[PDB]
Design a protein around this ligand. Structure first.
Ligand SMILES: Nc1ncnc2c1ncn2[C@@H]1O[C@H](COP(=O)(O)OP(=O)(O)OP(=O)(O)O)[C@@H](O)[C@H]1O
Ligand SMILES: Nc1ncnc2c1ncn2[C@@H]1O[C@H](COP(=O)(O)OP(=O)(O)OP(=O)(O)O)[C@@H](O)[C@H]1O
Ligand SMILES: Nc1ncnc2c1ncn2[C@@H]1O[C@H](COP(=O)(O)OP(=O)(O)OP(=O)(O)O)[C@@H](O)[C@H]1O
Ligand SMILES: Nc1ncnc2c1ncn2[C@@H]1O[C@H](COP(=O)(O)OP(=O)(O)O)[C@@H](O)[C@H]1O
Ligand SMILES: [Mg+2]
Ligand SMILES: [Mg+2]
Ligand SMILES: [Mg+2]
Ligand SMILES: [Mg+2]
Lengths: 240, 107, 380, 385, 62, 253, 244, 242
């Protein structure tokens, strides 16, 4: 149909290539962000069911853009490699010219700008990745959560999920989290993200990856034994 | 053609003293858009009646193709002739009629 | 376990024998229609049965030669004569005749052709629909009034302008536009007869039998005064040629041709309006579309926002609705689409309310029905 | 189990009792032959020499003559003599004519054709409701359109809404679509007509359109009804090509049914069940809602659905209580309900090769490997890139 | 093809009469119209009575 | 291969002979069966062989529906095919449609073959009785699973699938042995050698070896074979199979 | 669905899964088998040759194996034509990096950059994806011996052992079954030869049908020594493993 | 194609027709101009309570004396917004003069009044056809408060009140007569809320609607969610009396 054109504006008002991007986000891993008062917890699936895989050199889904800016993603791994690279360069650009450390909010916009640009320029596909960019603003200790979409726009939610079986996760996020009050403690906040991920992973120590990002360049990924500890405690409740 | 394939069978036709059934690919391909499957069955039956018989099919280069198009209605009969020929040949072993003889440009 | 297996085995035999026993029940009792006093009729009937004047073999005059040359339907020709006394002036080319089995003489002239009777079953008289409850405020609704009503009500103005009276309108629109609905409404209001012809039904063919029916029906119309002949679905048969195909066909060219020539050139008409229902003009042979057959064509235009609030209201009246319900808001959210799509939305809103166990449909119900229909059409 | 036994006991004393009653009751000595019967009888033999060559009544002229066409190309201007009222006869009726001299000796026909009998398949639905392991949510969409006006007319009447016309079943085979069709049929106990759409594809001249008309007549006569036009798409969007004589037929049949589905107005008392694989990637020929109303897409079975289906099957098996049910369904991706049905059948077959009469604890974990591998090959889903 | 009434049996013959009539009572200009239904340039050209109308067309001109 | 014989035995013979035993001991009844594997294995033969001993009426039913003209078109009388087979229990309908034909229509959904076939498949459960007992097995045969008519590909009612490999050297020894016994026995009993040394590719291949070895005795005007003849016969048959099949390729990779 | 759209990279399939990428898989698999086994004491690269003619000199062609630099070697499977652009760029890029930092290229870097051109051709430019898969065998001191694979799509995944091109599944079922976790370098050669003889038409696995190299950390004084074995040393070791 | 090289048989251009639909489906935005300020209201169309509504904004300060709300396509709108900001800033640098609203409407529309890939005595930077309208409100000294309806289609039209988006046909019908020039800034705010209340199915609160004004005095001033909320309360109150 109109899938062969981008320039052609379409009376449907909807260019099919754009629709098809969404199909692509769905297929990918589930990646979730839930934020406290002092933390972003990012719980994400990393598949590891692959036989004869040396896990050490296989890239973790989470990639440090900046020293305090992180990215998780759902959608095609190849296409996603371009966003990570543009975004890294721009990170260091920011410091080189403003001196100021990376404004996260600029960065959210910069990234979306690329998925937008390519919607207008024929002969350049719109990317079929949606991302989570999360960070902490210069001179600030309030957590910051953003999602980008392949529609070439951006938005902030109090907590959000993307990728396979996101429908299932969204019910959890409505009932156990609230915009009004995020779980004040870091600890509360991490335990709920583990329970959400369990709904679609259905038991895995390394299939669940938790990276907690705190203010002031504090990045630490939870220990496999500690992750295992969240699971067992939760699993006792399930039969009660 | 010019390698006298047909010519060989003209030779054998005299000497057999016995039936010779000389048919062409034209007969098999559609004549009512449905005639073709029936037409396969009749040559094999007719051979049994007047056995010994030499079954000779001159053209089959166009009846036998790897692929087909079922969107044309007329083509569907081409497809069906090919498949029934494979089936009948297995039920035609251990007969007085010689097992199907055919002539082609290529193998 | 095992002694209760054999309880199943017994059960099955029984059920089968009862079903055969139905035939025995029906019995041998024979009785036929003709109650109260039409079995006393049968007593008269007996002597007249033995009597002879029935049947008469039916044939058809093909030429009167001052005796008559009759042609029977088995196809066999005879020269015959008058029976008791059959006036010359009664027997005409095409007139049926009653002739005796084997003494072959005319008794009664019989009205021409048996084919009108067959086709008069299809014909339906002046359907009635009220123009006010006709949904939309469509422009189309108005141009129908010009074609049909105004030449019948006041033929004077048309003469004075020295235009030809409009007589042909071609209706086409997506399905659910209301082509059938508006034609029935203007049949009623103008107070003119109506002839239902359905062209999809034509199948009686002997190379040009379909052409006989069509000439007779159109001619029936001329005889009639203030009438409409509505040929329905002429998308195929008297619509598209099937010549295009490999082996092809032309029984449809016979039917098509006949209609074109009745329309084209001199030929009297008794205020015959020609209505043509095609789903698409594309399917319609271009021969018909281009002018000198049907005078006017209107492309149906899907109802305006004012017309879409208007159809919804018609439905909402039939419904039990909430007070202060925003008809206009529901309509705006809804696509610009047929009166049909809108009929469906009111149907599903009703049902979700019933399921939810409510007798009065909320605004909220119609927000749900809308979401349902958009998705449907799209996905396909 | 037990519930079924309780019923057997009653059913076998009902039949017995009836059968015995029947002798007397039908007659065997009762032999009505009193004045009213005797009249009918005497007359009927006299008037009717046989065989009797049927006609079709084309028109009446009021003078107790009619014009009929016999099967012979010559038609016959006949007397009406005896029996059937003049009023009762309306044009288009099929009629009995007497062979010596053609006269209207009655009617007993009503345009009886064998085609109507063939179609007529009210006969015992194999499904009762909720024998099926399907989900409450899918069946309670079909039920809402079809059942709910017949059982509770109060709500529809009060709202004032019209009763819906038709549904479309489409899936996904192995969602038990035709099972669903005969679940619905049982509950309504409506005259359940069935016709398959390929009988309306023929080279024979004009026969398709004739068949289409029959269907509307049949349903109306035997109303309330459900008309299963099964593989509606055979006539419609689905093909049989036009370089096979199809440049005549297929057009005429498609149009004809289309025209009668809208009609002068929707009947609103003939329910339809329209089967088709899906009309998502096929062309749509089922012409907009309001004549087909609610359209039903059956979900591909998720993990909770197949639990319910699975419970039926495990009942007969012995040594599947130790086997953990939950883990067999989870491990497999979400797939057809047909694939769980396939698995049960393979499972038993496989136990026999091991030599165990019914499944072993081991046999069930093994069963899953053979069925999953076969089915994933048959139907391959896009690989994540 | 319009003067073909019902069957192409009784009508193929009707047409042979129509040709005969039309030539006779000259001078005349016979206006024969649309030729498309009897044209049939195809190989599936009918050998039925449709051939007869068509042939008598060649005869008139010759 | 007898691998194969046990696998097919379970599936057809037991539910036909006694549905009542099968049903109870297992659960459900098996459906249609699809035989896949290369041409020239002798899949057809298997289908004939089961029908022989069971006493199923092997009705060979041509893929065509226009070869049937007797009571009308066999497309329109789909229903007559069902009704009559049911009466004619036990039966094997060998519905030969290889599905190599219609390369376009695999991925399509159009075509006359697709139309007729899908209604046919639906008819078996709407009329009923083949559901109750599968005394009439609808044996399909095809080269692969991936070339099927689109109606049969998707779920429906096909379930059992039997895979046939081209022979192994063990299986090859068996086929070769028994034809040689009937004919003239290989002297020095090096029919075992011939199978050990090489694999053919089909049991069709193997019957070709049988014919040729025997033709070599005919040229001498002898009526008995020896090992010397099989060693010539094998090299000729088998090598010819390779030179006709390789020519299609140019020089890619 | 019906109308398969794929003219350009930018134009999406309805499915959303670009058909040009799909066709790329077919192509990779067209070529014969190549196999990389990473061992704790070397990497072993062993493959059956594409070529098969004896007229054509199989011996001098190590079509599969080219070295890009002193530590890094790649095994190639797919489209020969397309492939030739990428092998050449990769060598120059490696030497560009050595210019800049005067250190050998890290294995991980070298793959990620090449993968990114492969994406580049779908992201922009009608230009077909260059449908080729390499198995990279490299060493760096960041992670030791490293093995990678690259998808035509333009993404990479590490592996303990992998197979590419034809009959990937069969070779894969065998490798995992008899896998020895530690893996000795001697062992890897034996294990590789066993897998190739079963997937290779000649079951005697002739030398002239074999390409072989071993990269060894088990080379004196703890260092990385790449050695391309010629057809004459393949033959000597064939008789050592006993398949012949 | 159906580009702009193709001239419609109609006398139109196909892309131009295609642009209108995107505005029709767009967000509902209302502006009513007085001679005491212009008040613009929008629906922020809140959809979930996990969505942060405050963050999201469809009323954006473009320049000191000008703000814009957007209706059409969300994608196009990025580019459109960046164009506008730039256009204003260039003139301020270049002549250091406050611009008219009129001058701004034109300049934004300058990129708009060309479509295609072909250019013949001009540059191209476009690669499509854009389909996004704005309400461009402001103040200039010369003609006071002005409201424009900037179109991606024909020449810009000045308006005294305008409503666009999906609530448009109703909203606009109400406006023709409810508009007057005698309104106060306080009368006018409540009138904007009133129309908004009717055409939005869900009930009116400050978490899904936001009000803003341009009065020269306070510049482009975004209303406090407290300031918005009270007037909603006031709205319900007068309707009870009424
Ligand atoms: N003006 C209207 N008001 C209300 N509903 C309407 C209107 N017009 C048509 N419909 C609805 O659309 C459906 C069909 O209307 P109608 O029978 O006149 O169709 P049509 O366009 O003539 O179609 P076909 O192509 O099937 O011949 C009905 O559900 C009817 O209520
Ligand atoms: N195992 C066998 N024993 C005896 N003869 C055999 C054997 N296998 C094949 N043949 C011979 O090969 C002939 C042809 O094989 P057949 O047509 O039965 O093959 P199939 O594998 O079922 O193929 P298709 O692809 O045609 O359906 C048989 O008629 C028979 O003479
Ligand atoms: N909603 C459903 N209703 C009924 N059975 C279902 C449902 N979903 C899944 N099934 C399962 O699928 C099994 C087989 O369905 P079956 O294959 O007869 O169905 P169909 O969709 O009518 O297709 P076809 O005629 O093409 O085989 C059922 O016995 C049942 O286990
Ligand atoms: N043995 C031969 N002696 C003479 N000419 C021959 C010989 N064999 C074949 N030809 C020539 O080959 C040509 C084709 O012979 P024909 O039987 O018609 O068959 P085809 O073209 O099908 O092979 C003739 O022109 C004939 O002269
Ligand atoms: Mg020749
Ligand atoms: Mg209509
Ligand atoms: Mg079914
Ligand atoms: Mg076979």
């Amino acid at each position: 149909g109109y899938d062969r054109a981008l320039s052609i504006f379409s009376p449907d008002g909807h260019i099919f290539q754009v629709e098809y991007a969404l199909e692509a986000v769905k297929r990918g891993t589930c990646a979730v962000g839930v934020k406290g008062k002092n933390c972003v917890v990012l719980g994400c699936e990393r598949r590891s069911t692959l036989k004869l895989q040396d896990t050490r050199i296989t890239p973790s889904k989470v990639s440090k853009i900046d020293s305090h800016v992180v990215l998780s993603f759902s959608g095609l791994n190849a296409d996603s490699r371009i966003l990570i690279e543009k975004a890294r360069v721009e990170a260091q650009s920011h410091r080189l010219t403003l001196e100021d450390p990376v404004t996260v909010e600029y960065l959210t916009r910069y990234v979306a700008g690329v998925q937008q640009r390519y919607t207008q320029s024929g002969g350049v596909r719109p990317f079929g990745v949606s991302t989570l960019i999360a960070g902490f603003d210069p001179r600030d200790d309030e957590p910051k959560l953003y999602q980008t979409e392949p529609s070439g726009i951006y938005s902030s939610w109090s907590a959000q999920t993307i990728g396979r079986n996101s429908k299932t996760v969204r019910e959890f996020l409505e009932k156990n989290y609230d915009r009004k009050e995020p779980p004040a403690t870091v600890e509360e906040c991490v335990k709920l993200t583990v329970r959400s991920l369990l709904e679609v992973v259905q038991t895995g120590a390394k299939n669940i990856e938790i990276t907690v990002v705190k203010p002031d360049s504090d990045i630490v990924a939870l220990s496999s034994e500690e992750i295992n500890q969240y699971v067992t405690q939760i699993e006792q409740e399930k039969q009660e | 053609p010019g390698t006298g394939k047909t010519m060989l069978v003209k030779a054998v036709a005299n000497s057999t003293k016995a039936a010779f059934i000389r048919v062409n690919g034209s007969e098999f391909v559609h004549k009512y858009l449905g005639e073709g499957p029936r037409m396969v069955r009749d040559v094999f039956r007719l051979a049994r009646e007047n056995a010994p018989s030499i079954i000779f099919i001159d053209e089959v280069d166009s009846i036998a193709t790897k692929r087909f198009d079922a969107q044309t209605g007329s083509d569907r009969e081409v497809q069906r002739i090919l498949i029934e020929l494979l089936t009948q040949m297995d039920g035609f072993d251990q007969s007085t009629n010689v097992k199907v003889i055919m002539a082609t440009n290529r193998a | 376990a095992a002694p209760y297996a054999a309880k199943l085995k017994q059960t099955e035999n029984d059920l089968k024998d009862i079903e055969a026993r139905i035939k025995e029940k029906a019995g041998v009792k024979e009785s036929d229609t003709g109650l109260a006093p039409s079995h006393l009729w049968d007593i008269m009937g007996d002597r007249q049965r033995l009597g002879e004047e029935h049947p008469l073999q039916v044939a058809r005059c093909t030429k009167i030669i001052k005796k008559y040359v009759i042609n029977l339907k088995q196809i066999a020709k005879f020269v015959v004569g008058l029976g008791e006394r059959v006036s010359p002036t009664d027997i005409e080319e095409g007139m049926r005749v009653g002739v005796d089995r084997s003494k072959y003489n005319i008794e009664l002239p019989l009205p021409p052709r048996i084919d009108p009777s067959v086709t008069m079953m299809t014909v339906e008289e002046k359907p009635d629909v009220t123009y006010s409850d006709v949904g939309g405020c469509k422009d189309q609704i108005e141009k129908l009034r010009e074609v049909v009503e105004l030449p019948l009500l006041s033929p004077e103005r048309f003469a004075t302008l020295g235009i030809d009276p409009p007589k042909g309108i071609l209706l086409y629109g997506p399905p659910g536009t209301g082509k059938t609905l508006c034609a029935r409404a203007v049949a009623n209001r103008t107070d003119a007869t109506f002839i239902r012809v359905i062209g999809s039904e034509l199948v009686q063919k002997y190379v040009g039998e379909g052409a006989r029916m069509v000439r007779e029906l159109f001619e029936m119309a001329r005889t009639k005064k203030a009438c409409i002949i509505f040929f329905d679905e002429i998308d195929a048969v008297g619509g598209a040629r099937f010549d295009d195909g490999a082996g092809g066909d032309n029984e449809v060219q016979r039917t098509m041709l006949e209609l074109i020539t009745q329309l084209d050139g001199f030929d009297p008409r008794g205020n015959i309006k020609v209505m043509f229902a095609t789903n698409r003009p594309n399917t319609l042979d271009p021969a018909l579309l281009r002018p000198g057959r049907i005078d006017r064509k209107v492309e149906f235009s899907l109802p305006d926002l004012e017309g879409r609030a208007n159809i919804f209201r018609i439905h909402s009246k039939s419904m039990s609705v909430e007070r202060g319900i925003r008809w206009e808001l529901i309509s705006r959210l809804c696509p610009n689409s047929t009166g049909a799509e809108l009929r469906s939305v009111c149907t599903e809103a009703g049902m979700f309310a019933i399921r939810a166990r409510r007798k009065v449909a909320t605004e909220k119900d119609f927000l749900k029905a809308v979401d349902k229909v958009i998705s449907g059409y799209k996905k396909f | 189990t037990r519930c079924k036994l309780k019923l057997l006991r009653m059913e076998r004393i009902k039949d017995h009792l009836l059968l015995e009653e029947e002798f007397v009751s039908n007659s065997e000595i009762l032999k009505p032959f009193e004045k009213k019967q005797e009249e009918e009888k005497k007359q009927l033999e006299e008037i009717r020499g046989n065989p009797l060559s049927i006609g079709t009544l084309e028109e009446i002229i009021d003078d107790d003559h009619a014009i009929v066409t016999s099967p012979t190309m010559p038609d016959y201007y006949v007397s009406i003599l005896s029996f059937v009222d003049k009023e009762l006869l309306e044009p288009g009726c099929s009629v009995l004519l007497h062979h010596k001299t053609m006269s209207i000796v009655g009617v007993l026909q009503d345009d009886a054709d064998p085609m109507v009998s063939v179609m007529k398949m009210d006969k015992s639905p194999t499904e009762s409701y909720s024998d099926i392991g399907g989900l409450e949510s899918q069946i309670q969409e079909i039920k809402e359109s079809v059942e709910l006006p017949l059982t509770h007319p109060e709500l529809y009447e009060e709202m004032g809404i019209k009763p819906p016309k038709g549904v479309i079943l489409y899936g996904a085979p192995g969602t038990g679509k035709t099972l669903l069709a005969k679940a619905v049929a049982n509950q309504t106990s409506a005259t359940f007509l069935r016709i398959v759409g390929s009988e309306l594809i023929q080279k024979y001249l004009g026969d398709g359109p004739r068949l289409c008309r029959q269907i509307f007549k049949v349903a109306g006569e035997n109303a309330p009804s459900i008309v299963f036009i099964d593989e509606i798409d055979a006539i419609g969007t689905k093909r049989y090509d036009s370089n096979s004589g199809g440049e005549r037929e297929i057009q005429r049949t498609m149009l004809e049914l289309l025209n009668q589905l809208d009609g002068f107005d929707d009947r609103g008392d003939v329910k339809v069940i329209m089967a088709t694989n899906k009309i998502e990637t096929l062309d749509p020929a089922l012409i907009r809602p309001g004549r087909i109303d609610r359209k039903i897409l059956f979900e591909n079975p998720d993990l909770s659905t197949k639990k319910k289906i699975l419970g039926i099957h495990t009942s007969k098996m012995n040594l599947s209580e130790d086997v953990n049910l939950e883990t067999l369904v989870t491990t497999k991706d979400d797939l057809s309900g047909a694939d769980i049905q396939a698995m049960c059948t393979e499972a038993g077959l496989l136990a026999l090769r091991e030599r165990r009469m019914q499944v072993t604890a081991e046999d069930f974990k093994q069963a899953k490997e053979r069925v999953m591998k076969n089915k994933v090959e048959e139907n391959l889903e896009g690989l994540y890139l | 093809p319009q003067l073909v009434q019902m069957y192409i049996g009784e009508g193929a013959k009707l047409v042979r009469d129509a040709f005969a009539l039309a030539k006779e009572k000259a001078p005349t200009i016979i206006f024969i119209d649309e030729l498309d239904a009897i044209g049939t340039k195809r190989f599936d050209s009918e050998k039925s009575g449709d051939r007869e109308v068509q042939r008598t067309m060649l005869e008139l001109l010759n | 291969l007898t691998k194969q014989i046990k696998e097919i035995k379970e599936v057809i013979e037991l539910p036909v002979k006694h549905p009542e035993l099968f049903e109870s001991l297992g659960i459900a009844q098996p459906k249609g069966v699809i035989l896949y594997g290369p041409p020239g294995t002798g899949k057809t033969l298997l289908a004939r062989a089961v029908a022989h001993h069971t006493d199923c009426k092997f009705i060979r039913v041509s893929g065509a529906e226009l070869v049937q003209k007797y009571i009308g078109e066999g497309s329109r009388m789909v229903r007559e095919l069902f009704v009559m087979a049911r009466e004619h229990a036990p039966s094997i309908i060998f519905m030969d449609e290889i599905d190599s034909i219609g390369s376009t229509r695999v991925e399509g959904s159009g075509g006359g073959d697709s139309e007729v076939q899908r209604t046919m498949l639906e008819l078996l459960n709407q009329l009923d009785g083949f559901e109750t007992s599968k005394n009439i097995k609808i044996i399909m045969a095809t080269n692969r699973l991936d070339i099927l008519d689109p109606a049969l590909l998707r779920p429906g009612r096909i379930d059992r699938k039997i895979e046939f490999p081209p022979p192994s050297v063990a299986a090859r020894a068996e086929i070769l042995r028994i034809h040689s016994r009937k004919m003239n026995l290989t002297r020095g009993i090096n029919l075992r050698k011939v199978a050990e040394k090489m694999n053919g590719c089909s049991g069709a291949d193997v019957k070709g070896v049988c014919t040729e070895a025997g033709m070599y005795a005919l040229r001498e005007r002898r009526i008995h074979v020896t090992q010397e003849d099989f060693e010539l016969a094998v090299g000729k048959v088998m090598n010819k199979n390779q030179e006709t099949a390789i020519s299609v390729a140019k020089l890619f990779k | 669905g019906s109308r398969r759209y794929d003219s350009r990279t930018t134009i999406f399939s309805p499915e959303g899964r670009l058909y040009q990428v799909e066709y790329a898989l077919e192509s990779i698999s067209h070529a014969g088998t190549a196999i990389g086994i990473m061992a704790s004491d070397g990497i072993v690269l062993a493959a059956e040759r594409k070529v098969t003619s004896t007229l054509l000199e199989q011996d001098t062609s190590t079509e599969k194996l080219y070295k890009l630099n002193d530590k890094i070697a790649v095994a190639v499977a797919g489209l020969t034509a397309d492939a030739e652009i990428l092998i050449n760029t990769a060598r120059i890029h490696a030497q560009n990096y050595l210019k800049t930092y005067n250190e050998d290229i890290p294995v991980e870097i070298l793959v990620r950059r090449l993968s990114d051109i492969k994406q580049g051709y779908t992201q922009h430019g009608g230009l077909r994806p260059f449908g080729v898969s390499f198995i990279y065998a490299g060493y760096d001191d960041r992670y030791g011996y490293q093995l990678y694979t690259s998808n035509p799509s333009g993404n990479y995944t590490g592996w303990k052992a992998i197979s590419v091109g034809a009959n990937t599944s069969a070779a894969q079922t065998l490798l995992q079954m008899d896998y020895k976790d530690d893996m000795k370098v001697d062992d890897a050669i034996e294990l590789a030869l066993k897998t190739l003889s079963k997937t290779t038409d000649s079951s005697a696995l002739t030398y002239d049908r074999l390409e072989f190299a071993t990269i060894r950390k088990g080379a004196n004084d703890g260092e990385v020594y790449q050695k391309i074995f010629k057809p004459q040393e393949i033959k000597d070791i064939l008789v050592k493993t006993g398949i012949t | 194609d159906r580009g702009v090289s193709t001239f419609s048989p109609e006398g139109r251009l196909f892309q131009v027709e295609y642009s209108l639909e995107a505005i029709k489906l767009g967000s509902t935005a209302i502006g009513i101009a007085t001679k005491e300020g212009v008040v613009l209201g929008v629906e922020k169309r809140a959809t979930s309570p996990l969505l942060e509504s405050d963050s999201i904004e469809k009323i954006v300060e473009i320049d000191r004396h000008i703000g814009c709300a957007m209706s059409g396509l969300t994608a196009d709108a990025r580019s459109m917004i960046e164009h506008a900001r730039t256009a204003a800033v260039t003139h301020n640098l270049y002549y250091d003069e406050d611009i008219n609203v009129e001058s701004l409407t034109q300049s934004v529309c300058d990129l708009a009044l060309r479509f295609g890939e072909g250019a013949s005595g001009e540059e191209r930077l476009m690669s499509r056809p854009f389909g996004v309208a704005l309400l461009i409100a402001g103040h200039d000294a010369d003609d006071g408060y002005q409201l424009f309806h900037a179109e991606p289609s024909g020449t810009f039209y000045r308006y005294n009140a305008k409503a666009i988006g999906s609530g448009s046909e109703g909203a606009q019908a109400e406006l023709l007569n409810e508009w007057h020039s005698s309104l106060t800034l306080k009368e006018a705010e409540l009138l904007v809320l009133k129309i908004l209340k009717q055409v939005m199915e869900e009930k009116l609160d400050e978490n899904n609607a936001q009000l803003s004004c341009i009065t020269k005095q306070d510049g482009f001033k975004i209303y406090d969610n407290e300031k918005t909320a009270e007037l909603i309360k006031e709205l319900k109150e007068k309707e009870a009396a009424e």
